[PDB]
Amino acid sequence: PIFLNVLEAIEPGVVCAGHDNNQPDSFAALLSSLNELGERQLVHVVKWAKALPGFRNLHVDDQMAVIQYSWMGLMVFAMGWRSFTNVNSRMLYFAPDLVFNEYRMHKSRMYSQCVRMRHLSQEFGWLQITPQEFLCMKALLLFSIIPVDGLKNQKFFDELRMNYIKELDRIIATSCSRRFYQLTKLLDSVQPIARELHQFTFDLLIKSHMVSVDFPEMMAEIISVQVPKILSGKVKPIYFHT
């Protein structure tokens, strides 16, 4: 009821990349489009997160933090769901105007990463993930990565996270335990993928000036300030399993 009504109500609508599909595929154009789409999606993630139950209860500096650390995983998970529901995982549905087939996966030089995201997409079908389970998991994904030095108010964060896990249990409700096992495994699988992308985007930003790839202002900053903290082991994901 209440909790699920809210998640469904605040779920972002379709987001386009503004990609020119009439031009032949090129490394720089595909990556520049992805970056612009990433910026557009980041804007939607903030509006979404702001409306999540209990989110504004977090210290403002922590609100900023979880959004900046979780952004990649959130985009990957949602994209995997879109791919599953729109093209049965056949291709990566980054956006209606930015659909990646194998050729683009290769041209973008992110092939290995894309194969992993395609696999995640297939899991949604193999596990028969429901739209409601998808919504609760995505919400839990926002509270799955924190700094080892802790947050401004770790207590409130832990309470919020605990409450979202409780909501997932209610949605699930030996059958329950088995389901919780597969969903937590699925959630854990997002993290390694996001780490690979974190590394990829980091390297790309460092050489963007030489490869002609444009990075919007907000992204550039997140990738040069927050992403390195993840890559250097200062910020780590909370795994359910080891």
Partner: peptide, 11 residues
């Protein structure tokens, strides 16, 4: 702090 981001958050 990410100026542009904080703005969106408090907007």
């Amino acid at each position: 702090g990410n100026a542009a981001l904080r703005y969106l958050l408090g907007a």
